[PDB]
Design a protein around this ligand. Structure first.
Ligand SMILES: *[C@@H]1O[C@H](CO)[C@@H](O[C@@H]2O[C@H](CO)[C@@H](O[C@@H]3O[C@H](CO)[C@@H](O)[C@H](O)[C@@H]3O)[C@H](O)[C@H]2NC(C)=O)[C@H](O)[C@H]1NC(C)=O
Ligand SMILES: *[C@@H]1O[C@H](CO)[C@@H](O[C@@H]2O[C@H](CO)[C@@H](O[C@@H]3O[C@H](CO)[C@@H](O)[C@H](O)[C@@H]3O)[C@H](O)[C@H]2NC(C)=O)[C@H](O)[C@H]1NC(C)=O
Ligand SMILES: *[C@@H]1O[C@H](CO)[C@@H](O[C@@H]2O[C@H](CO)[C@@H](O[C@@H]3O[C@H](CO)[C@@H](O)[C@H](O)[C@@H]3O)[C@H](O)[C@H]2NC(C)=O)[C@H](O)[C@H]1NC(C)=O
Ligand SMILES: *[C@@H]1O[C@H](CO)[C@@H](O)[C@H](O)[C@H]1NC(C)=O
Ligand SMILES: *[C@@H]1O[C@H](CO)[C@@H](O)[C@H](O)[C@H]1NC(C)=O
Ligand SMILES: *[C@@H]1O[C@H](CO)[C@@H](O)[C@H](O)[C@H]1NC(C)=O
Ligand SMILES: *[C@@H]1O[C@H](CO)[C@@H](O)[C@H](O)[C@H]1NC(C)=O
Ligand SMILES: *[C@@H]1O[C@H](CO)[C@@H](O)[C@H](O)[C@H]1NC(C)=O
Ligand SMILES: *[C@@H]1O[C@H](CO)[C@@H](O)[C@H](O)[C@H]1NC(C)=O
Ligand SMILES: *[C@@H]1O[C@H](CO)[C@@H](O)[C@H](O)[C@H]1NC(C)=O
Ligand SMILES: *[C@@H]1O[C@H](CO)[C@@H](O)[C@H](O)[C@H]1NC(C)=O
Ligand SMILES: *[C@@H]1O[C@H](CO)[C@@H](O)[C@H](O)[C@H]1NC(C)=O
Ligand SMILES: *[C@@H]1O[C@H](CO)[C@@H](O)[C@H](O)[C@H]1NC(C)=O
Ligand SMILES: *[C@@H]1O[C@H](CO)[C@@H](O)[C@H](O)[C@H]1NC(C)=O
Ligand SMILES: *[C@@H]1O[C@H](CO)[C@@H](O)[C@H](O)[C@H]1NC(C)=O
Lengths: 175, 328, 328, 175, 328, 175
């Protein structure tokens, strides 16, 4: 969508992730593992619900209106009675059709955004110790065990702790 | 820090989003089929087929149309003084009394249908010098001949039909609806037999209005053994005004007034069954739930209903785009 | 290159945006109360309570309705040849001359109200053999009996009412509106006293149309001492056409024509005071400013007005989201 | 909103900033200070005004229309006269409600954008001499006095001047 | 890994987007003139000026209006039993037979115009005791006097006009439209010369309805040598119902029925030339292409047409913003 | 627009680029060149067409309606016949005007996005071997001949190959 994460730099989705809408898979010292991110999952879900409720808000009521079916042929007045209703229906139909198209388009960029926002947030947190591989995976240039992965995920990762190890592994090598 | 930080390994962290094997196609500004994770339908397209008799007061008309229930066709006497939020009118309804026609039938049906009550008050009209309570064999009431319960057919007394000139003041604080009519005889002979004058006349007026109708003599098609017709007219008399009825013959006089109210009442043609359940939205196809914003069941509705639309399906995506990881 | 000399240090630069202590809640696609820095209201919900007499030409009807000003009820003689962009009609208005009724009152009021002029031209109609200028005590003009300034009541001369057959050609290049009428007597005796024939008739026609009305005799409710009525009719005669008036009795003849124009004129029922100020948008509740796009004052409007909406407030956010330091 | 700066990576607003909508706060070896940015302030304001003017553009005028209040009961024709107006009012009401909701939603992402655009712009200018602390603050890794802060703000900062000092302070240290 | 690449240099890669020298201005949420690379117009604002005779069946009325083609004015005899998807009615059309008026002309023109056929079936009505086929010099048919091809003017036989009482059952499975009328004489003498009774009467009825009209005597403006008029009325008789025509004089009787269908047919006033080409959308200004979504040619349309809008141009940007590099 | 690339960080367009909507200009050891990018050019064009087709989709047809021109003055009924049509026309006119404004606004951010998405994509691919000059040009810190420029363009550039040369040229120098 507008941000280019979903169906963009993040090649495809994980049918395996049954516990949330956005999340982390990882491969480290102690093996591999997956974990939904619940804050962006809730952020995407709340906006979609808010949107949904506003569309479902109050069917207004109408009681005695005009006749909309006729059994005799009458001419002028019945012609106007049919024309009023036919133009009311075409106007409300254009309205429903434009509404779900703007709505759906927005829902698709809104979730694209939440994805990219989680990506950028993780990026900012890893500071100088990781590099973007460009497919939505960061290469972390220091030993990062499962508690380390869990601190990135729960937003408490301290980059400073690993900066000297990371910078060394990342740059120096032989060039 | 610690000391010579030698253990130089790396980790990989990958961000991603879910995908589902199924997925639903929705329309967009730029695409008309894009697949998303999940969607919800906004067009109610199905009725239960039954008119729920709750919360509105539905009055099943059975084989009476509202106008016959109003005039008082014998077979509709059940409906006297009845009230409704919605009068359902059935396709099977029939008339079975003196042949009549109502010049602006549609306005009278409208006006009564939204008044919502057939509450009838009898007034003491005094017709001096004519014969009251005429009846006919086309309007059998029980064994006998009869006529509309609410109208009073006056014919000559002995050898004269005088000039009727009566008055009835509206002294209450509400409007009064008076239904009355005129008799169109088949032959000049029928005219003079019943009303003596060879040309009758009815003038009904208030301070604010007047209607004079003259009868029309001639043969119409045989209907229930008759070629004559009566035509129905109506007069609303506001508080403080006064009805003056003046006639020379052919009057079908009122017996009092219906009271008029202001409300949410209306009428609907439907052969759907009434049933016990609560539903707010009524369609001639039966009630429909009003949880969706739009509906495609029927453009005729009574109560809190979704807005009728031409489309039969409109799906609102309620999830991100589905980009599956294989599809199994 | 640049040679630092001695300093080794850092700086911190932080980007941010303002926030206000107050803040306004607005509706969104995804939220219905989100707080922003500032908003502006799009629904005009209040009237001044006064009809500004500028820029449109407001004609206060005082106690005349436009139709009585048209016919020429004595108390409305002030309105002769008057013009208006908006005729304000007051609830206090009353009629005070011969009892009349206008069959399609609403169309005549419409048609005159948007013509916008009561400019009346007198034509030299010659009625031979009847008595002109009949008047009544229900239409007192000054000390005397009178009648509508613009209509001419003809009764018999001596012992005859001939067949009137007159004509008046439209030779100008504009349409002519002729208002005329018929007299419905209370009793056959009144009929023959005034018009001799026991049944009158009025036929008014052009090359393009014709109307024949026959009087209706009978008693109506006493109004200003009378039980008779006159009914008003209208005939527009296009350029090059010709009026032919033909009658046998009961004619209330025209004295000439009103001219019809095409304009932005209309009529409005309002008891609001007119005042001096300029306002483009008029509502029966008084003028309203038309700076906002929508309004919720009244669905009846004349002039450049905001579109009427059901909502009484709609705020357009005109600032970013308010995320304060402390609280709100 | 879609960009995640306002009420996102930038924790909250400054009630103190009374001279513009977006701006800068800094702490350097010479003091601390604040300064509104007037270009992004004008960019956000102009779009909001443009938007506002288009909504307020020309109330069209109507003169003689149909009657909208009745005193007698008439039936068929008056029923149609009420139904035409009632459906006109519900259609124009749906229109005003959808209009301010799309409008407001857009105004919120539009200003979110202007914020993030100022952030990215500053970022690009500091080139290799600063690091993002992830809360909308850059750590500048070289001595930057008040004229230096002012050059960043007025867009004339030359990164090259400070590159060798910055790169040294930033990387080397001890890892 | 790779050995000494002596020269270690750099490269510059720059991303950019196109720009065009021309560019088009479009409106936006925030701006009303922003320049883009390219745009497409959504308002069709021009007609060819010709009504394409394909795919709809256009029937050029030449100098007949649909109602005269219906009644059968001699000069319109070409239109008998004709059919149309669109009947174009020309401003030059004229009537040239006995002066008539149709009380609800607009409904009769409507009802026939969308029936879409003038297919006329003659029925064997038997008028006993009156003289059929009356004609007039205002309705010349060829050398002779004549009358509408589809109506039958009955006058007295010898010294009597009996009471006509005839019937015609609808036994087919479709509705029948019967056009009939009444003769309004100029003078009582004309009345008694033609119809003997000094007051005629026509009552036409089915089981479902009835109309009684009485003639109106008097002079109207001279039209084609006459001051009399006939007024046209219509009666639709449903399957299984029955027409009863009953008169006492002044009847202009039907000669059979038009059949009514249900279709997409209509009528349009236009002096545009018909031409050979296929166009789906017809406007009284000529056909217009319906490729754009909106149109500003005319608010009157027949067929698949763009929605009429007040705007004469609306450009949808179909390209990015134009930010050129040179000057202007 | 919302992303700030077009008429933003990319100062202006190239009237010279006649073969696509987005693209690359470069300068390398082998000389200078220009080349349209056809994937983002197709992405921007497809969305705009999709959008266009939906707007042009099916003119619905109407046959017998009400009269919209009158020659006599009639009052009440003709007043309603004019009011129904006038309110139909103003409602469909508001609809056309709001439609092209939302549409155009979106078309401008949609193409702004495609630009910025191409920019970010290129950025991610060059990994540690290039720096953003902030005007939409990357400085590539290693010798990159025409085939090297071609691999960046056709998305097969391997950063690892040049990483040691790049990191050296980029950092070390003298600070
Ligand atoms: C004027 O003409 C009409 C139509 O020609 C005459 O109507 C017909 O009158 C007869 C005799 O009253 C009706 O006959 C009855 O029919 C029913 C069913 O067949 C039957 O039960 C009776 O024993 C009798 O046969 C006939 O139905 C009726 N038809 C219609 C369509 O109205 C009318 O009598 C004529 N009137 C005069 C005064 O000449
Ligand atoms: C036909 O019946 C009506 C209603 O019964 C009669 O109307 C009433 O007629 C009387 C006598 O003209 C009216 O009386 C007058 O009332 C005024 C007001 O108090 C007073 O000034 C007079 O002294 C006299 O009492 C009465 O108002 C009137 N009422 C109504 C509602 O119209 C009518 O006279 C009868 N006509 C015939 C020819 O029998
Ligand atoms: C009732 O009054 C009308 C209007 O005053 C009379 O109508 C006029 O009648 C005369 C004689 O029939 C018509 O004259 C004709 O004029 C044409 C030329 O236009 C001429 O070629 C004929 O030979 C004939 O002379 C005149 O046109 C007509 N005018 C109008 C506007 O209708 C009518 O005759 C009077 N009727 C009675 C019974 O008194
Ligand atoms: C984050 O994860 C680490 C490892 O489990 C734990 O020690 C720390 O307390 C967590 N903090 C929060 C807020 O979850
Ligand atoms: C799809 O969306 C609707 C409305 O948000 C929700 O009730 C439903 O549970 C969703 N389906 C799934 C599988 O989440
Ligand atoms: C109808 O209601 C009125 C008012 O309560 C009452 O007087 C009258 O007798 C009722 N008649 C019937 C048949 O219920
Ligand atoms: C509802 O009723 C109408 C008329 O009977 C019918 O055409 C329509 O198809 C029905 N729709 C549903 C959902 O029953
Ligand atoms: C709020 O917005 C309106 C319209 O843009 C503006 O006139 C007003 O000054 C704004 N309020 C403040 C405090 O800026
Ligand atoms: C009305 O205007 C006409 C035309 O100027 C004039 O002849 C006539 O006398 C005027 N009458 C009055 C009462 O103003
Ligand atoms: C305007 O007038 C109407 C009718 O008098 C009234 O119901 C409405 O509340 C008034 N509104 C205002 C803002 O005065
Ligand atoms: C930017 O700020 C510095 C420090 O005040 C000043 O020397 C320089 O000229 C300024 N340039 C502009 C364009 O303001
Ligand atoms: C402008 O846009 C229209 C519709 O997308 C297209 O047919 C036309 O070729 C475009 N013009 C150019 C120069 O690309
Ligand atoms: C009109 O059509 C009917 C039915 O085919 C036919 O009997 C009749 O003779 C036709 N008349 C003319 C003039 O075409
Ligand atoms: C179409 O016809 C109408 C009425 O003739 C005219 O006002 C209008 O300007 C014409 N428009 C075009 C595009 O021909
Ligand atoms: C990319 O460009 C290089 C240089 O022309 C070439 O060798 C390589 O095969 C290209 N790959 C693709 C997919 O175009």
């Amino acid at each position: 969508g507008l941000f280019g994460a979903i169906a963009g730099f993040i090649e495809n989705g994980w049918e395996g992730m049954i516990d949330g809408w956005y999340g982390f898979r990882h491969q480290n010292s102690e093996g591999t593992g997956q974990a939904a991110d619940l804050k962006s999952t809730q952020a995407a879900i709340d906006q979609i619900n808010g949107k949904l409720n506003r569309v479902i808000e109050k069917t207004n009521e109408k009681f005695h209106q005009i006749e909309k079916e006729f059994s005799e042929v009458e001419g002028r007045i019945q012609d106007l009675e049919k024309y009023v209703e036919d133009t009311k229906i075409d106007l409300w139909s254009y309205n429903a059709e434009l509404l779900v198209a703007l709505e759906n388009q927005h829902t698709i960029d809104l979730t694209d955004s939440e994805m990219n926002k989680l990506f950028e947030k993780t990026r900012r947190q890893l500071r100088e110790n990781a590099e973007e591989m460009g497919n939505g995976c960061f290469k972390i240039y220091h030993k990062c065990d499962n508690a380390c992965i869990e601190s990135i995920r729960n937003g408490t990762y301290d980059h400073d702790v690993y900066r000297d190890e990371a910078l060394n592994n990342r740059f120096q090598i032989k060039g | 820090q610690d000391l010579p930080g030698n253990d130089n390994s790396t980790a990989t962290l990958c961000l991603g989003h879910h995908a589902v094997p199924n997925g639903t196609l929705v329309k967009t500004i730029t695409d008309d089929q894009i697949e998303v994770t999940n969607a919800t339908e906004l067009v109610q397209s199905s009725s239960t087929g039954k008119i729920c008799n709750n919360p509105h007061r539905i009055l099943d008309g059975i084989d009476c149309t509202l106008i016959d229930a109003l005039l008082g066709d014998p077979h509709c006497d059940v409906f006297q003084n009845e009230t409704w939020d919605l009068f359902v009118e059935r396709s099977k309804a029939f008339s079975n009394c003196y042949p009549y026609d109502v010049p602006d039938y549609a306005s009278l049906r409208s006006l009564v249908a939204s008044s919502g009550t057939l509450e009838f008050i009898t007034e003491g009209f005094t017709w001096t010098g004519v014969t009251q309570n005429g009846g006919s064999n086309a309007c059998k009431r029980g064994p006998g001949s009869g006529f509309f319960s609410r109208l009073n057919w006056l014919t000559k007394s002995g050898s004269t039909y005088p000039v009727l000139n009566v008055t009835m003041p509206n002294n209450d604080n509400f409007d009064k609806l008076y239904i009355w009519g005129i008799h169109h005889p088949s032959t000049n002979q029928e005219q003079t037999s019943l009303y003596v004058q060879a040309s009758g006349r009815v003038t009904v007026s208030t301070r604010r209005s007047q209607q004079t109708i003259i009868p029309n003599i001639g043969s119409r098609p045989w209907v229930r053994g008759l070629s004559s017709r009566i035509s129905i007219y109506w007069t609303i008399v506001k508080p403080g005004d006064v009805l003056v009825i003046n006639s020379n013959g052919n009057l079908i006089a009122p017996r009092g007034y219906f009271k008029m109210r202001t409300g949410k009442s209306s009428i609907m043609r439907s052969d759907a069954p009434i049933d016990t359940c609560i539903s707010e939205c009524i369609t001639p196809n039966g009630s429909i739930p009003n949880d969706k914003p739009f509906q495609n069941v029927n453009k005729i509705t009574y109560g809190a209903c979704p807005k009728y639309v031409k489309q039969n399906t409109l799906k609102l995506a309620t999830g991100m785009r589905n980009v599956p990881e294989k599809q199994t």
